[PDB]
Design a binder for this molecule. Sequence first.
Ligand code: CA
Ligand code: CA
Ligand code: CA
Ligand code: CA
Ligand code: CA
Ligand code: CA
Ligand code: CA
Ligand code: ZN
Length: 468
Amino acid sequence: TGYDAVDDLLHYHERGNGIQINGKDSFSNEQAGLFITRENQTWNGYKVFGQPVKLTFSFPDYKFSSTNVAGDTGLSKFSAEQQQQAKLSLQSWADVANITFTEVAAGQKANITFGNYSQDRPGHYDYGTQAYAFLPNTIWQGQDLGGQTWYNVNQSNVKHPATEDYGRQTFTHEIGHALGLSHPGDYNAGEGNPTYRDVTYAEDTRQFSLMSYWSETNTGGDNGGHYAAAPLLDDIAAIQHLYGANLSTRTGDTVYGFNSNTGRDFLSTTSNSQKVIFAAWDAGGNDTFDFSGYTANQRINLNEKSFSDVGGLKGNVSIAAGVTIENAIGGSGNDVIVGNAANNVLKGGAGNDVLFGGGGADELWGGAGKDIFVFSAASDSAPGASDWIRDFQKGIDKIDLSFFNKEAQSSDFIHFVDHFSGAAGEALLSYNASNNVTDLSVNIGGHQAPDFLVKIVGQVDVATDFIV
Ligand SMILES: [Ca+2]
Ligand SMILES: [Ca+2]
Ligand SMILES: [Ca+2]
Ligand SMILES: [Ca+2]
Ligand SMILES: [Ca+2]
Ligand SMILES: [Ca+2]
Ligand SMILES: [Ca+2]
Ligand SMILES: [Zn+2]
């Protein structure tokens, strides 16, 4: 049924509680955020949480034969492509928390620096390391190391971060450390041969945080060989904990995915081939998840902290805590689109879709194909704030009310009548041929008047259009 698909999506990646996943404890978004910031180091001071911060960053002009604090040498300044990408990564962090970054001169003192290294000792190239950074307040010999970030330029991803997504992800990850974030676990277990097996909580994967080193597949995600460029779900909780949430970000009407007005490479796509991976942070306005350009079967969940399967990937799109996304457009595959308590505009597109409005006055468009519109509560479409099904096709589309008889464990709870009598479960269809509108009224609660009313554009055939 339509309802089963909805139910499945709503319980996708449940966490916290007393859940155990890979035999490991499950942490909520909030718990994971606190754990990632367990060192309690911030640019505002030790254990100084929630205050905005102003930071400067630069690309020092390092000497090849110079040695850095960690002992690496064969140093060099970030190239133009590296600089470009590092700036995009900084911005991705500035979008979600109250952090202001200002670029200063190669010469001057900066809070955050970027540099490349290539040798672990003079005249000896290192092909085994990737990058490292120091957390704020890292004091060495009366010198603060905090803010320094270094990368192995012998690695092609580091050298060409504009074409190698692991490279862009690395930049974002190192900057994360430079801001006060740690890996989601110490994995101090056994020795120095860490595995996902070594994590503290199940959500320590690249599905939830780019601070993690473990594959998103460990938790059931699949990024299709790609790497997220910007902070993920748990990364946002962590950084907002440190510097507060950025309430100024994308406060107007924003479109994510296709026909994007975000101005963010990681929040936009121009073709079926360009896959999106992101955790959405948005502070206000009427927004839309536009995934109309994808051909795969997608599952879109507009609730806060939930995961979506988009563009052929699995659990690659999520919504941060405290964000309300209002509209969703599916593609040409067979989709499942679940809304939230606000008014939503849900469009299935071609394919056989399942649409669920949830609370509020929603506008549902099945598009082409055989669509199913599901309801599970009288409050889903209360008289006064009714949902509208704008393109119902009789003998083709369906209205799924299966939840009610299922719950009542009775085949006769929901039953169609010619006139209301005040009995609970009574359902009535009123068709207006002059205006092409059918009213579906149901007395779920059993009151003097129906507590559920859906307005449908088109004719509905009671003999074939319902799932009860
Ligand atoms: Ca917005
Ligand atoms: Ca919104
Ligand atoms: Ca579709
Ligand atoms: Ca459709
Ligand atoms: Ca809704
Ligand atoms: Ca249809
Ligand atoms: Ca609704
Ligand atoms: Zn790291």
